[PDB]
Amino acid sequence: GRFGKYGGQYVPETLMPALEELEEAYERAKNDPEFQAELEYYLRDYVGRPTPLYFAENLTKDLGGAKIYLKREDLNHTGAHKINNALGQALLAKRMGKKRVIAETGAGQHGVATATVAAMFGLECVVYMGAEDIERQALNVFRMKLLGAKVRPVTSGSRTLKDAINEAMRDWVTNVEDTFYIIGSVVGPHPYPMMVRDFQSVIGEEARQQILEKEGRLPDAIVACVGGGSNAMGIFHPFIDDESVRLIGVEAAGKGIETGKHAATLSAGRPGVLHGAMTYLLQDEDGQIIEAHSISAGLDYPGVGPEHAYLKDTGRAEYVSVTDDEALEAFQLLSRTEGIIPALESSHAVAYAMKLAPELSKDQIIVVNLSGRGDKDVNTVAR
Amino acid sequence: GRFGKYGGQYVPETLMPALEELEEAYERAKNDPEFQAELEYYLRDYVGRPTPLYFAENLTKDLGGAKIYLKREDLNHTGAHKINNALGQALLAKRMGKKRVIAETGAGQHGVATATVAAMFGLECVVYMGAEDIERQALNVFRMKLLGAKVRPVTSGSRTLKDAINEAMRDWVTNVEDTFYIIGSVVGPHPYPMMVRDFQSVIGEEARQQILEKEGRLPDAIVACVGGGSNAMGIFHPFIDDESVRLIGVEAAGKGIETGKHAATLSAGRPGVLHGAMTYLLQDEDGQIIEAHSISAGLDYPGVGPEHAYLKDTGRAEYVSVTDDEALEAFQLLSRTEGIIPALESSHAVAYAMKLAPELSKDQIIVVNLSGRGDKDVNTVAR
Amino acid sequence: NRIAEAFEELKKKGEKALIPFITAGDPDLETTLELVRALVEAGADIIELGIPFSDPLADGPTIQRASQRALASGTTLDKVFEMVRELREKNTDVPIVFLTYYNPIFRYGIERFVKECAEAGVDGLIVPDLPPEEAADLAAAAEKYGVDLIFLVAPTSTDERIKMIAKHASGFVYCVSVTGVTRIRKHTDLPIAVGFGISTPEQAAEVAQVADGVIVGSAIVKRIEENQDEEDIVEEVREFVRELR
Amino acid sequence: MNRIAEAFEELKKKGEKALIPFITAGDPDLETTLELVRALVEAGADIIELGIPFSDPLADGPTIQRASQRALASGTTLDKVFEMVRELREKNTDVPIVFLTYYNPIFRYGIERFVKECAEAGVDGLIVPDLPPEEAADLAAAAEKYGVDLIFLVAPTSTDERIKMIAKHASGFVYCVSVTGVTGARSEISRIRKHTDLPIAVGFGISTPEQAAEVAQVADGVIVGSAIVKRIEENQDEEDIVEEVREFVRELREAVKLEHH
């Protein structure tokens, strides 16, 4: 459960038996063809995969360099990649006889994804959400309730995403007999980094086949925004062995790294243990966890997947950051040049691809992971 | 251009040259393998087609009757079926060398779909919108502007959909040489009813092939909501000659036909001429056009497509209505049962299938056209 | 037909037709009828009365606002028919042309509408949104009662389309001078009147020098709108039209 | 020998049971913690657990969550609790002190640097709630190097295999978690973890003298935290926090003992 020195299972002993049961369960499901065939059925008919790989021709011409392809995860049911993972984990919960699934959510996208698959599967669903995030995501809170989930506000600690994950863990350890904890990113104790990355590898597996068919070469670079890291790992993993393919994760610099108000865990954090994983963390000099800051709430996890920690240290992937202002300009440019309104999270990736495309030749190819649609962010951008 | 006694081209002589060029341009495009291969390309990679045909297992079991399949037009880029039509007309405009596309919009869904494909195609875009509709749809106005369209308020007449169509027709006749008028439903003069139906027939063409592969048999009934009638014609048309398939269109009865404030053109309207088509129409004693009222604005077109007038009078299609309360109930049921938040327009079709399915045998099959996603309506439903 | 008699008397004197258009019921039907009498006095040869419609697809800002004001005053078809009868109580002379969109015709009932036309004393009809192809039942009704159907021809109209509009025209053919909203001229038999855009006495005599009649609408409606209720309105409309004469 | 071992050996020779109070260090402030420690000793506590406040205490119920947030807003740091322990040691070299700390403050501080400071300040043992044996190799070797005990938790759902493995690395005592869950005063309730001869203490949920007495009949020691932290929180607020804690812990002390017949 280790990615180099990173990862692990840093959880209380009260939770170790639950993790053993989960890793053994996942191991069986992974290699069971009925499980994989049932998951593929729902990915196709319910989620709507495969998502297309779209040649952004106006953008390509505007920037004057590399070809820009957008992996259209904005077309999934619910509008983001998150549902790929919620779906796989909920199917495993049913296979383990769990009547109840819980989830954390920050901006509400994972909470919506989890409530969505829970409704379809008939599972009881409870979503933990910090009260500061509730206060800012009234619409996503109302979606979760429409979908039949209970929203439990977390008023403890800093009242945001990290505190919601703590409470969900507490719920899980207490109710493990009947409850499955659907984690929202490639974070937490083994086997969750591995398992979430596997359920999201469908993104890169499609993307790899689609680019070969469309262009007959592999990308020169793949650009994906990185909060907890799950959409990035999903498109990165199937290209890990393609040594010529650059893997570029884009974090939120907020107002600027130098201001301290950012969410750039990989570029400015330092190693530590959070939520069961050894990884990079935004933390203070006493090892206390710090809040991350971004114009997009979805990039607000102060940690990052331990597998990105490993890819950064080995140099297989390169991690950069773009400011709120740059994300905003990409949000606007992509809308008016391709008619795609991207999530402000994914706008960070679009923004770095705009910096890189002009510096490549016209024969080269950038794939941008369009991790979600930005209808949810239209109010924010107007403000 | 005639559907029995309905249809035709009730337009001033100044518009007749523009319509004849459009008639001939579309007739060539309809039969042009290259136009069709291009349109298929953009439907695939940009819009995300085909959309899945999804077996709603929880709903089926809760209603206790026929198997319920949802044609998932909520999964299109922009969240509704409108883009199928906007894409086809905008591709025709582009290949005709037109520099500018115009569109009317009431609730903004067609305006968004039009601005979206205009942005992708590099066409200038102007959307006419009644001032009363602008004040109720700030979000969609903002999105249209994000997509690079100009939004032209119409403060003449009753300042609503009716009046935006007239202004748009006025713009079209004045600027025909470089402007294409993208009509948003199966309404208006020949060849728009036929052409919009043709661009939307992809819905029914996919559904027919999908339902044959999922059940080895044609559906026992297709249910779709009907405002102007475009999503219904798109799914109906490829089954018209399958006599064994019932075609059921569902209109908005609002607070109840007896209140007067409704949008039920087929069930309560009477023949008349509107916007260049002879069809059924909501009009007063003097033949003045009345405005329609419903919980879902997407259903407030005072008229209906002449092809539905034809289908109604020949009895090939049966037209019913459901009230605001019924759509609201269906909006909630589908969200909690399937994790699909449907448009309020589409929940009229769900509401009727909720009535039809119990009456039907277990082995029977109902396809519901899920014409759009309901994220735009969550704010309306809460109030 | 009154229309036929009027173009004949003009040509005997070598004169051209002045054909004012106003919207009936703007600002109200009592002012319309005083207006029609003042247009008569200032020398109008044919009066077109706009029947206000909630969706004037072929009208620019000016006449759209006039229709909207006219509908706010309660203007309906039957009310305009009653004003025409009042006019016919004295002015059994001036030809009256109704400019109306088709759906009010169709909803009123075609046969009934035309019959009410002949009884009230309306001599011609202009239906902007009804081309000759779709105009059969109206044409059959109007031919029975001797009400002329004035069809429009546009600069962009094909030659084939001009020929077909010619074989179905009655009274006069209405030449739209610009592909828009509110030779060319040739060449079948009927009187040809040119409309759209003419708003100054220079332009109108300029059109007079080319056609059999000039149609002027928006220019007169503008003055109805600007004349603050005093009337005034009538005196302004009369002096403007006298200049057009 | 470690103070923890000395304490348990002395109780064994007296026929007595260890009462082990837990308080959060720096709640409501470190001066009050000091006063509380001194009160706890005078009230008969045999070993004192000091919670090092963490911003994300995965293993704590609401009571101790709130104490940690209060302690952190009052500026509590590792270095400050060390200085308080050194002020303690100036006058009391006897009482065993255990730091209960999540791992990331220890990591970050520096593992060996942290255990070294433990030994120099006078901290006898460590409870690290999110650190299983499989991840504890580094901390365990530093602890062994400096004579600091590493107390591991055993939960009711731990398998005999996991116990063997836990007890193999444990020193000082074994912490037996009475409930599969989080800290917090509960009302209810074998192990019997003898694959080891270490003393066994039971914690989680023990909130009343009657419950403490029931626990004292089966284990070498009784750990009470949330119930004591409640009394700190609920005063509310004169430094008379001390009297309520002293009074409660004296009840616990009379209760934690072998029952009479």
Ligand SMILES: *Cc1c(COP(=O)(O)O)cnc(C)c1O
């Ligand atoms: C939540 C979210 C993210 C960030 O989460 P990751 O685990 O880093 O992918 C990125 N994009 C979108 C659209 C999201 O909803």
Ligand SMILES: O=P(O)(O)OC[C@H](O)CO
């Ligand atoms: O003067 P116009 O441009 O308003 O056109 C003439 C009137 O509209 C009557 O047809």
Ligand SMILES: O=P(O)(O)OC[C@H](O)CO
């Ligand atoms: O009494 P509890 O429930 O707070 O648990 C014991 C302490 O918290 C930890 O030693």
Ligand code: NA
């Ligand atoms: Na992060």
Ligand code: NA
């Ligand atoms: Na698809």
Ligand code: NA
């Ligand atoms: Na309608």
